[PDB]
Design a protein around this ligand. Structure first.
Ligand code: GLU
Length: 266
């Protein structure tokens, strides 16, 4: 009640199914504003905005990136993280992984979803574990360049993870600028490409046509997605409270089931 509720809050996000996607285009009708978008993060944004009694406007991140330390970016970070640092958006509501490095420059709510790094293969690929990848030659692998999975391997103290880091850093052509290009490479590489991909995306893709991909191995780590705000935001406490409210009242579970379980065609 002690923050501006006439302001339309700018919500940075990033198209990445099923978190956020464009509603299917139809004949003779043009969607505008937030109506263009659907998905888990759209439903989350709607519910958070309702909890806070605020208006909001989704504005997609202007470089298509989640956020990485970048010696060229103003404020030191690109992507949604940089938009928050530079006060170009008020909130980011996306599949933004909570990392120690990002917490030093922006604030996160408690997590609204838990996840881990996982492996996606085309069915038939003779890979069952991360260790397997490092013991063979024919299957190349990679991840989203410079995101949280990339940084996990760069920074990990586990020898296996450092071995995977050294390979990927020396073979950046086998990593990708969008996770969807990684998934296309899995599908189109005849069993010779594996993708390191966060488990909710992996699980979503594997459960839908063409049913040609699968997850192998245990998740490599455990972490969360959070709602992100620029430091000092007047909304920080209320947004965290709202996430906790939606977690306790079953609403986060409802929209997770909506976008993952209700959409299982395989
Ligand atoms: N969710 C990740 C991007 C995907 C990935 O790095 O695997 C991030 O916030 O950086």
């Amino acid at each position: 009640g002690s923050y501006d509720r006439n302001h339309t809050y700018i919500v940075s996000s990033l198209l990445e199914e099923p978190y956020l996607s464009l509603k299917q285009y139809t004949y003779g009708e043009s969607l505008v504003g937030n109506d263009r978008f659907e998905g888990y993060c759209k439903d989350l944004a709607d519910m958070l905005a309702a909890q806070l009694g605020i208006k909001y406007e989704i504005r997609l991140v202007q470089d298509g990136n989640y956020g990485a330390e970048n010696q060229y970016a103003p404020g030191g970070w690109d992507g949604m993280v940089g938009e928050l640092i530079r006060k170009e958006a008020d909130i980011a509501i996306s599949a933004m992984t909570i990392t120690a490095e990002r917490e030093r420059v922006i604030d996160f709510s408690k997590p609204f979803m838990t996840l881990g790094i996982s492996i996606m293969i085309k069915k038939g690929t003779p890979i069952k574990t991360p260790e397997d990848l490092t013991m063979q030659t024919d299957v190349n692998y990679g991840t989203l360049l410079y995101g949280s999975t990339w940084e996990f391997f760069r920074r990990s103290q586990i020898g296996l993870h450092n071995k995977m880091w050294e390979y990927m850093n020396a073979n950046q052509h086998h990593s990708v600028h969008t996770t969807d290009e990684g998934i296309r490479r899995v599908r189109q590489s005849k069993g010779k490409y594996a993708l390191l991909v966060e488990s909710p995306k992996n699980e979503y893709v594997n459960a839908r046509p063409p049913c040609d991909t699968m997850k192998v191995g245990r998740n490599i780590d455990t972490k969360g997605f959070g709602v992100a705000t620029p430091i000092g935001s007047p909304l920080r406490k209320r947004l965290n409270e709202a996430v906790l409210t939606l977690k306790e009242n079953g609403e986060l579970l409802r929209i997770r089931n909506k976008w993952w379980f209700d959409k299982t065609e395989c």
